[PDB]
Write a protein that binds this DNA or RNA. Structure first.
Lengths: 94, 96, 78, 108, 95, 84, 104, 91
DNA sequence: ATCAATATCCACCTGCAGATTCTACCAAAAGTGTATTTGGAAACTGCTCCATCAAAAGGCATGTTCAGCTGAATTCAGCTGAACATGCCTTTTGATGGAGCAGTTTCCAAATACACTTTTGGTAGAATCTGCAGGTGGATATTGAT
DNA sequence: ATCAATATCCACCTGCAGATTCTACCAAAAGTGTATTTGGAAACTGCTCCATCAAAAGGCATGTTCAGCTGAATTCAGCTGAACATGCCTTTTGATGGAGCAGTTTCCAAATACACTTTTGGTAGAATCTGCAGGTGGATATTGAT
């Protein structure tokens, strides 16, 4: 039986080596059309256009996760907490 | 050998007397105002130019100014701004 | 339907970011922040499309919407 | 002839629509510039200046002074959410900062 | 005798209320000319231009101090340390 | 002009203390002042680099305030109050 | 005989000239400006393509994919400073795990 | 509709005569070239406006390159640009 | 520290389906060659604005002490999150039908760019006012010790 | 809770540095009248997008255990803030020299606008390579017991 954190660390290598989409495409399009119809009904989407949203969201959130983890390392911890996410957004000029 | 240069000082003073007839304004604050007006004008005009180029169109109508205002101003600032702008445009078109 | 973004997917995104341990209370703040970003981007993109007098949202509209927020994206036409 | 009324009077504004028109033409934004664009833009500029000037005037009177100085402008911009979101990437000379001390650093 | 931290807290109020320059102008002007002559010999400065540099540097550093102090509050301390500054610079998208 | 030497000594410790007090800091470690002067000098070098480039393009020996405003705007740092 | 060959470039000086004129950047456009700009663009493209090709050799592949571009940009100092505000589709990220989280 | 694909392919055959490139990477390259062209042209237009000048000479492109490229890259970029300009003017 | 034993990657080989590379043509930019304008470079010069330069002071920085209070270091109990196994269903992948738009062309009514001529509001001093900066004095609020 | 001791607001006064108003010009909008584009309206034309439907599968959601991690509680050495004496240097203010801008004029080397004449890169097919997904075998790393 593997130690806790070991299967997680060697997972980090899998995802930092791969580049494929890390989000299921079907739920992501469901949400995109939800918000799009929330701002304007009867809007259509290019197949390429929705792929652009997934890449941008993945990159933004990945960077946010790295910065949150930096906030934890600084706070002398490993477990990320919502106390850390709101710190990153506060220092990001956002 | 004495020169001259245009500025928005007089109009800012007119608006100041509009909203608060008693209050004055210093020269440094006037320079702040000029820089602010110029920055906003540059932002709006730039986004308008990009909007024009994006649609293979070479002219700038008030529609592009309206959409740029909708893109650059956060919320009720954009709502009231569009309201006053449409009021002024509809008042100017009638040429009354 | 935003709840459709599953927990293991957020775990995978965090693991790509280099995080070792994840609290359970993270997922709420995560979906919230994602929803804010998506709402902003879709707002600007839908304005870009609605100005062009069209009903279809092309990828260039998304690229412009992101570029307005200081987030250049390559791979879809600019 | 038709006796001249300026474009500002025809539109009901305080900012000169003609000068904004000249800046739009000579500014290298587009080759041709519509007729309602300078009216619209001058209207928006007047509205925003009126906004920040009213805020600065009230913030100045709350200090019991009758003349707007840069500090009043900084307080007026930083105490509002939307204006601060618009000018988050801006600093004002002679401006100062917003008085804010975290609750952790206060006496107990 | 004032207790430690009290004279410090009431300092924050005065300096957060005032707007004047918190750095002596002569040493700041000496350094600006040092770097400018480091990049090109025989360069002059408008009297107003150096005032522009001081305002920008002061504002930048004040904001950096606020964010560093936020990093300290998050790390559950009050004393700011260089371990906190390099965190702020790393998250500001500038370092 | 002059072979200047040690002008960083002009940024006093109590001056950095005052700047930090404006930033809302209550307690300061001794190791702060070094990193402070370092970051300040780096920022100043960048801004003066861009301003001197603007001047050398403007065919001049004097660095006006507008050059500084442009140099700051290039770094995403708009400044009001010296455009006129 | 073309301007691109007369200047020793691979990028069309004529296309840069047309884009500069029709782009609403300035009323008048110099003659050496499009040459200069096409030269700079060619140089930077050559830089990034050499870096990506070398990274593809380190991966032992003969076809440049987005991952090679991301790795080539993020491993270089100047290019990373230039494109810090940019994301690359199909790109991934730089493999980096903090030293605090490792065993031993 | 125009694109920079062929010229990028030419430069690739210059620096790597055997190696190919994928279509996605080609789109990346085109997007990059357009973004950089936009940066340079924008700073050049602003520089033109700042001096009451209405034309853009290669001097403004050189100063914009010196402003937008950080350090070790701007030297090489200016060298290649002035090289191309001289080689184009002299013949 | 060793050591046996999984599990887990890593290195190299391998076939193939899908992109990739190579070919055969043309509207539209690119190139050449005149007929012109024109911005801007060159030369003075009028003149602000910068750079030194002096000097006392008094405001502030420096150096040293001392104590209180904070950051660092340690222990540890409880719990939260990871690992793993399970089974079920939501996702992908493939294929069709057709419908609602974009996109292409064509042709004007309307809007805007120019080319000149007057009419002013805007700007730069001159001449006036006038809130604000320092400086006192009183009345509170705050802070620290019993 | 009291009480002494500082630090802090608040108002007032006055002289003045600066904000305001008044006046005299003048660059630039406003007005008149042509000449030029262009967005837009109408009609097609394909073309991606949306909506279903099946099936293979692998990822998701659940539940259980357990280990390591995080928060709480304590201690204390050392560090940093407040204080005080000492003395050093940053501020104001004036005046000059002159250097370096701005402003003004003048005249070409260069840029623009067109009229034709080529060249080409873009689009739509025909015909090849090569990383993706696996597969073994070896090389490491982990985890657990001596």
């Amino acid at each position: 039986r593997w130690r806790p954190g070991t299967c997680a660390i060697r997972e980090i290598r899998k995802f930092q080596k791969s580049t494929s989409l890390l989000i299921q495409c079907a739920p992501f399009q469901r949400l995109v059309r939800e918000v799009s119809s929330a701002q304007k009904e009867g809007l259509r989407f290019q197949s390429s256009a929705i792929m652009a949203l997934q890449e941008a969201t993945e990159a933004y959130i990945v960077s946010l996760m790295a910065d949150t983890n930096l906030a934890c390392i600084h706070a002398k911890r490993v477990t990320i907490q919502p106390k850390d996410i709101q710190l990153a957004l506060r220092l990001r000029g956002e | 050998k004495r020169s001259r240069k245009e500025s928005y000082s007089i109009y800012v003073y007119k608006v100041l007397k509009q909203v608060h007839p008693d209050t004055g304004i210093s020269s440094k604050a006037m320079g702040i105002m000029n820089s602010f007006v110029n920055d906003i004008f540059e932002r709006i005009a730039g986004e308008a130019s990009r909007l024009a180029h994006y649609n293979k169109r070479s002219t700038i109508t008030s529609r592009e100014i309206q959409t740029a205002v909708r893109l650059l101003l956060p919320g009720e600032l954009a709502k009231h701004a569009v309201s006053e702008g449409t009021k002024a445009v509809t008042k100017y078109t009638s040429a009354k | 339907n935003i709840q459709g973004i599953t927990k293991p997917a957020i775990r995978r995104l965090a693991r790509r970011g280099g995080v070792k341990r994840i609290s359970g209370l993270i997922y709420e703040e995560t979906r919230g922040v994602l929803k804010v970003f998506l709402e902003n981007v879709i707002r600007d993109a839908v304005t870009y499309t609605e100005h062009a007098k069209r009903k279809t949202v092309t990828a260039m509209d998304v690229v412009y919407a992101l570029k307005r927020q200081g987030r250049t994206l390559y791979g879809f036409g600019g | 002839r038709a006796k001249a009324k300026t474009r500002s009077s025809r539109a009901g504004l305080q900012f000169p629509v003609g000068r904004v028109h000249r800046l739009l033409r000579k500014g290298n934004y587009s080759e041709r510039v519509g007729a309602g664009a300078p009216v619209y833009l001058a209207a928006v500029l007047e509205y925003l200046t009126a906004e920040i000037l009213e805020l600065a005037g009230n913030a100045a009177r709350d200090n019991k002074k009758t003349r707007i100085i840069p500090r009043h402008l900084q307080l007026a911009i930083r105490n509002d959410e939307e204006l601060n979101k618009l000018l988050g990437r801006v600093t004002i000379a002679q401006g100062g900062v917003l008085p804010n001390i975290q609750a952790v650093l206060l006496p107990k």
